[PDB]
Every structure is written in structure tokens, then in C-alpha cells.
Design an enzyme around this catalytic site. Structure first.
Site, PDB file in Angstrom:
ATOM      1  N   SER A 177       0.758  -1.297   0.000  1.00 14.44           N
ATOM      2  CA  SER A 177       0.000   0.000   0.000  1.00 14.44           C
ATOM      3  C   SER A 177       0.775   1.325   0.000  1.00 14.44           C
ATOM      4  O   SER A 177       0.272   2.389  -0.416  1.00 14.44           O
ATOM      5  CB  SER A 177      -0.920  -0.033   1.200  1.00 14.44           C
ATOM      6  OG  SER A 177      -1.354  -1.373   1.208  1.00 14.44           O
ATOM      7  N   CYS A 178       1.978   1.319   0.543  1.00 10.73           N
ATOM      8  CA  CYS A 178       2.744   2.565   0.471  1.00 10.73           C
ATOM      9  C   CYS A 178       3.193   2.717  -1.051  1.00 10.73           C
ATOM     10  O   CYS A 178       3.842   3.718  -1.462  1.00 10.73           O
ATOM     11  CB  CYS A 178       3.909   2.507   1.506  1.00 10.73           C
ATOM     12  SG  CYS A 178       4.782   0.892   1.496  1.00 10.73           S
ATOM     13  N   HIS A 179       2.836   1.762  -1.912  1.00 13.00           N
ATOM     14  CA  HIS A 179       3.217   1.922  -3.352  1.00 13.00           C
ATOM     15  C   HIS A 179       1.903   2.213  -4.170  1.00 13.00           C
ATOM     16  O   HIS A 179       1.872   2.206  -5.445  1.00 13.00           O
ATOM     17  CB  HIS A 179       3.951   0.651  -3.860  1.00 13.00           C
ATOM     18  CG  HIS A 179       5.299   0.439  -3.243  1.00 13.00           C
ATOM     19  ND1 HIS A 179       5.893  -0.815  -3.141  1.00 13.00           N
ATOM     20  CD2 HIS A 179       6.190   1.327  -2.718  1.00 13.00           C
ATOM     21  CE1 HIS A 179       7.087  -0.687  -2.575  1.00 13.00           C
ATOM     22  NE2 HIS A 179       7.294   0.600  -2.311  1.00 13.00           N
TER      23      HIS A 179
ATOM     24  N   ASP B 292       0.649   4.747  -5.035  1.00 12.25           N
ATOM     25  CA  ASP B 292       0.881   5.875  -5.978  1.00 12.25           C
ATOM     26  C   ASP B 292       1.254   5.493  -7.440  1.00 12.25           C
ATOM     27  O   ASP B 292       0.784   6.161  -8.451  1.00 12.25           O
ATOM     28  CB  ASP B 292       1.945   6.821  -5.331  1.00 12.25           C
ATOM     29  CG  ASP B 292       3.304   6.105  -5.063  1.00 12.25           C
ATOM     30  OD1 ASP B 292       3.392   5.136  -4.223  1.00 12.25           O
ATOM     31  OD2 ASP B 292       4.315   6.510  -5.708  1.00 12.25           O
TER      32      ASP B 292
END
Ligand SMILES: *Cc1c(COP(=O)(O)O)cnc(C)c1O
Ligand SMILES: *Cc1c(COP(=O)(O)O)cnc(C)c1O
Lengths: 388, 400
Positions: free
Chosen positions: B345-347, B349
């Protein structure tokens, strides 16, 4: 039989509305903040709303707010970023020439210790300026005189932690702003100004335009909020540089990575709202109780007691009363040990510091409570020093 | 009704956890070291929670340090390692780190930062282009005279594959006796266990590691975390990143977030109590999911988390359906029921680049470009599995 809490400057209970916001966020906004599903979207909107709430509380803009784990992290982050900023400015012109910091002798541990660390490691130089053995207010002239070509930051607490006395942040900001124009003419970089405002919020109006500072520390548990915090950075990434201490997933615009703690942010946001809506009402109540309290302490103790926060002309927090009672048996911790009702903390001029006690009142404190602790303090003093 | 299959991204909070937090907010609001009731209750919650976390991982209470989360915990170990090398020298050249190519951003980025700034050197060991596991021999061959830390995640979060943490520790233990003969510093071992807690037994004595990252929100706990440090102050050093008031024995200062800690502790008690139950359920549901995907898509689907003899988390199924119109983010964009992710999830973007992690494990760009990560949880039912497989069937049709 009940205790009377007068240690609000150390911590505060959570407002009931804050508790509810946290509970609801945990229940309903548990998703990862980037995602498009409901729980995710609710987390996004909560974080976004909380950012606006903190900005309003201090008269800044949402984008100037960075969420952190607490005041300690916020304080360490400013100090850390400054060192990094200096190194980035020496590598761009081009243990040797080192960043210089200016602070005061009465700062919180999370400002003094990171700075002592940098000195021990020979990574930086620091001038700790003394507070006025009278007002216990730093003097602006001492700060300007300590400035060097390598000076990077002036960090001065907004209010004296032991006594409540307000430091002169505005004047410091203005006179540093003027000095920066001369420095800039000589190719010297701008001295930035930070203030640990932890004790001011919810007790006295805090406006960043008025303070003129570049960084300001926000601490949730000092204003009936949860145990997280934030850092204000004036136009972060444009007007003011901010180098991160942590590296990871991109959150807080890579200034402070890690998955956002939505519930904590919801609570801090609500806590901030309440300040924005009622600061004046809080401050008034605090002032009535603290003043009534100081009236009762002089009535009871007379010539024996010294009010260490009160000076004619000297602005102070509305809720703080630091006092000392004369006598070799009335050391602060001894007085408090003998009290059966009062909850407060030790408040530490030399002979007076040993007997200092810091009373700090809150939003709910009553005169009836004041009466109970003056009576408590009366017996404690009789037990220890005895009648005089 | 949406069906949630993104538990590796985050999990909801157990009801008992939400309650521990709310109660703590209300009654344990004071300073942990003060003797008044609200303070004493906070000190008890914190001590109890430290014991809970130690029990969860097979260690001792004093080995546990509370942090603001996995990110802080991972950065802390890397910072402390640089410092320790520096202190050991001074009391007497840059420290060297060994990690692998598929670590979370909070291990890869701090290490990259150290290289960019010339503070340390780092070898990013590639994982098997076969199954995606980093291999013991490649880690061991990567050792240098100044190597002072080997950090390797317990389980990769995109495919679920388990890394050989035990063997790595055993081998480094052996190597350290030889290094000691020459006077070289000892190599310590850390594992980012974020994805493993609550899904598989985690025991530091079995793992043999010196440090271990703990992440609340991957196991139905709050958004804070902790860090295991073996015999901290006695067999392992921990230099702080933060300075202040003395909390956490100065390893991590700042007023303790008691409610968050109460939440963290309750979540760990549930793992200690029920880990084997969560694991068995996750595995039953995941294996069922894989059977339905295969029965619905046949040879059109590749199961990227599944190799013979490769251990993997029990709840994870990374898959790709061949098709030019089946990029992972496109399939998910069309699903109406399923909530999953293309990778971590931190990806979120850049959902349209194939996964760098999948790439590094040996997955074609054609296969990785179409990868979707399904990670099931404690509550997932076979019925829900059936709903999302149909949802995928209609998604793939609207697309192809
Ligand atoms: C979730 C996770 C972390 C911590 O990430 P946070 O954003 O700080 O919660 C670290 N490592 C791995 C492998 C993870 O899955
Ligand atoms: C409370 C406080 C802080 C922050 O300390 P934490 O334990 O991190 O909350 C910082 N500065 C001042 C002046 C404070 O009163």
C-alpha cells in the site's frame, strides 16, 4: 476523601469528545489512508480534517502541519533537520565549521538533551542563554549577541516550564528577521526560529503570524488530546527546509513516513477544534482559579510564602502558580509527600528553588478544590516546619 | 457488501483491542511514574503490555521497546547499528550492511540513504529469480570485514514467501566465532517480522535474531509498534534516535502513549492465545481460494506465491491472469466487490508499474505487470471467496 489534580502542565485527561472521536475512528476509519474503499476514505478525510483543525488552532495553513508521535519527536525533528540543513548548505557552496544553535537554560529535556548530545559528539555548538534571575524570561539581547556566522537556529520555549512566564518569541522573531537581512548581504544564511509551544496551546492564543516563527511544536497531551503531536513548519519545502529523520513509505509527504495513526490524529484534531472554539473560555476560568488560589496562599501563609510566577508587568500562563515556602523542612518534594489531597509537582534563585512547587490548574478546577489544597498544604507545612 | 482481501496492507482492530484502548483512554490517562491512580493504572498497562509482546515472540519483557510503528522500529535498528560501529571504533572505515532486494520501504530507503551520503556500504542481495526467497549462501558470501548487520524480512509482503531467518542466524552465529578469532566485529541479525505476526508462530529463540520489528496494525492491533533487542544493555546495544525524558530506559524517550500500548498488548495476547487457529483458518481459506481461481481460470492464471517446497504465509495468494488488458490495477479497477491491492500500500501511488519486488523474484514483466495480491484474514469465509472469484470473472470479461 478525593484527590485534587493540579498538575495539568505535566499531562491532561482526554476531553470526552476527544475520546469519542478516537473510538469512532478506530471502528470506522481503520483502512489504509491511500485506498478508495470506505474505511480508507474515511481515514483520508479524518487526517485531512485534523490537518486543517491544527492549522486553524495556530493561525497557519493545513500544508504547514506535519503529524508526529509526540512533542519529543517534533522537537528532535527540528533539531535534526537543522544539522542536516547546514550540511546541505556547506556542500552546496563547495567537524570543521559546525552548525551553531541558540537556546535557553530552562528548555524541556526533548530540546536540551538532543542539543547536549550534538555538543558531546562535536557535531554542533550551542549557546544556552540564561533566564533572568528576576523574571525568569530570556532576554532578547542575549539571544542576538550569541549569534555567529554558523548560527542556524534559535529554539526558545514559548513559556517557562516551571513558572508559566511567557518568553518573548515575537520580538525574538522580529529582531532575528532584521539580522537575517544583514547576514544575507554577507552571503550568510538565515537563522531560523523555533518555539516549543507545548504549554501554550489551549491556555493562551497561539498565532504563528504573530509569533513570526519558522517552526512550532504541538503536543497533544498538554491540551486534553491524545499522546501524539505535530510540528508546524512555515511553507515546508518552499519557505522553510525540513530534512526528515525517518525514511520509508511516503506519508506526511516523506517528511515523516510510516502509516498514519488515524485514531490518534482524529483525537488531536478534535482536541484542536475545542481549543479553537473555547480558548478564551478556558483561559478565563484558569485565570480565575489561579488568582483565587494565589489569594488563598498569601492569606494562609503570608510572609513565609514566595509566589515565583508573579511579577508586575510579566505575562504568564493563566493556570500556573509556582511557589516556595520558607523553611529548611519545606523542600518541594517533602511538601508534596505530606499532602493527602493535592496532586502537583516539584517546581525547580537557589535557596528558593529547593522548596519550589508547581501548581497548574485546569478547565474543571474549582475554588472548592483550591480550598482543599490550601488546607492540605497548611497541614503539610505544620507537620514539616512546624508553627512559626 | 465489499469483500476485503488486503489484510497484509492493514487489518481492522479486534473488538477487545478497541475496548482496551477506550478503557485506557478513560482511566489510565496519567503519568506512568506518578503514584496517583490514573498514573499507576498507566504504569500497570505498560508493564502488562510489555510482557504480552514478549510472550508473543518467545522473549523476555526487558527485551521489548515500544515505538510509534514499524517504520520507526526499522529506522531505529539501522541508526543504532551505524552508531554502534562508530562507538566501537572510537574506543579502539564505514560499517557494512547486508539486506535483500525486496524489503519494505522502511528498510530499503534508510539503507539507500546511508549509501548516498557515504555513511555506510550496503549489499542488496538479490532473491532467487526462481521462488523469491533470498538464499542463505548468498547472504553468507556477501559478508565483508566491516559487515555489522544482516537485516532480512521474515516474510515478503507481496508474495508471502518466508525467508530462511533461522538458518541465516545459525550460520552467522558460526561465522561470528571465526570473526572473533581475528578481532573482526560480530555481525548482528535483524528481521522485519511485520507480516508474520498473527499468521505464523514467531519465536526469537527459534529465529536466533538479535533484533525483530513488531507492527501493530498487521495483527489487528493499533498503529504503533515495538522492537525486540536481545538482552538489550547486556548482549545487544541499542543507541537511541530520540533524546528526552527518560522513557523506555532512554532507548525511546517521550511520554508513553498508554492507550495505544494497551491496544498493542491485547492484540499480542490474542496472537499468543490464538495464533495456530488464525493460521489454520487462513490456510484453509487461501488454499480454497487458489482452487477456485484455478477452476475458474485454468491455465490462464499463474499463482505467483506458490512453489513446491517454498514456505509461505498462510493467507497470501499473489496471482496474475494472462491477458493484455489484465494489468493488476485494471482488474481491481473493474472488480465491484473485492478490495485487494496490486502490491504493498505505500506503493499505491504507482499501481501501474509492474511490482519491483515481483520483478526481483524472477516474475516476467508480462506476468508481474498483471499481478494482484490477495491476502485473507481471521474472518474470511469460503462464501466470500466465492463472491470475489465471480467478481473477478466479470471483471476480466468486461475487460477482455
Ligand atoms: C507494514 C510493514 C512495515 C511497517 O510499515 P508502517 O508503515 O510503518 O506500518 C514494515 N515492514 C513490513 C514488511 C511491513 O509489511
Ligand atoms: C510536554 C512537553 C514537551 C513534550 O514531551 P512528551 O513527553 O514528548 O510529550 C515538550 N516541551 C515542553 C515545554 C513540554 O511541556
Amino acid at each position: 476523601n478525593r484527590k485534587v489534580y493540579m498538575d495539568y502542565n505535566a499531562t491532561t485527561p482526554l476531553e470526552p469528545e476527544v475520546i469519542q472521536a478516537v473510538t469512532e475512528a478506530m471502528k470506522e476509519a481503520w483502512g489504509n489512508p491511500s485506498s478508495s474503499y470506505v474505511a480508507g476514505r474515511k481515514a483520508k478525510d479524518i487526517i485531512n480534517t485534523a490537518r486543517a483543525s491544527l492549522a486553524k488552532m495556530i493561525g497557519g495553513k493545513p500544508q504547514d502541519i506535519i503529524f508526529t508521535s509526540g512533542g519529543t519527536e517534533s522537537n528532535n525533528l527540528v533539531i535534526h533537520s537543522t544539522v542536516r540543513c547546514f550540511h546541505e548548505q556547506q556542500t552546496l557552496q563547495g567537524e570543521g565549521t559546525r552548525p551553531h544553535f541558540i537556546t535557553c537554560t530552562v528548555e524541556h529535556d526533548s530540546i536540551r538533551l538532543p542539543l547536549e548530545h550534538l555538543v558531546e559528539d562535536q557535531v554542533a555548538e550551542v549557546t544556552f542563554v540564561p533566564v533572568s534571575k528576576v523574571n525568569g524570561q530570556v532576554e532578547v539581547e542575549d539571544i542576538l549577541a550569541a549569534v555567529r556566522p554558523t548560527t542556524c537556529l534559535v529554539t526558545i520555549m514559548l513559556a517557562n516550564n516551571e513558572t508559566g512566564v511567557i518568553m518573548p518569541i515575537s520580538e525574538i522573531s522580529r529582531r532575528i528577521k532584521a539580522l537575517n537581512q544583514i547576514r544575507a548581504a554577507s552571503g550568510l544564511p538565515r537563522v531560523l526560529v523555533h518555539t516549543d509551544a507545548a504549554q501554550a496551546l489551549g491556555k493562551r492564543r497561539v498565532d504563528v503570524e504573530d509569533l513570526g516563527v519558522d517552526f512550532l511544536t504541538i503536543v497533544g497531551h498538554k491540551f486534553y488530546g491524545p499522546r501524539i503531536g505535530a510540528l508546524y513548519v512555515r511553507g515546508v519545502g518552499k519557505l522553510t527546509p525540513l530534512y526528515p529523520m525517518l525514511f520509508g513509505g511516503g506519508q506526511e509527504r516523506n517528511f515523516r513516513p510510516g502509516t498514519e495513526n488515524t485514531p490518534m490524529i482524529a483525537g488531536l484534531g478534535k482536541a484542536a477544534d475545542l481549543v479553537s472554539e473555547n480558548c478564551e473560555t478556558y483561559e478565563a476560568h484558569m485565570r480565575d482559579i489561579r488568582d483565587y488560589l494565589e489569594e488563598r496562599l498569601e492569606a494562609e501563609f503570608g510572609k513565609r510564602i514566595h509566589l515565583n510566577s508573579r511579577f508586575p508587568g510579566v505575562e504568564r500562563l493563566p493556570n500556573t502558580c509556582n511557589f516556595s515556602i520558607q523553611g529548611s523542612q519545606l523542600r518541594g518534594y517533602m511538601v508534596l509527600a505530606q499532602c493527602q489531597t493535592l496532586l502537583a509537582s516539584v517546581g525547580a534563585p537557589v535557596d528558593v528553588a529547593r522548596n519550589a512547587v508547581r501548581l497548574s490548574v485546569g478547565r474543571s478546577t474549582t475554588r472548592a478544590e483550591v480550598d482543599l489544597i490550601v488546607q492540605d498544604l497548611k497541614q503539610a507545612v505544620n507537620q514539616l516546619e512546624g508553627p512559626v
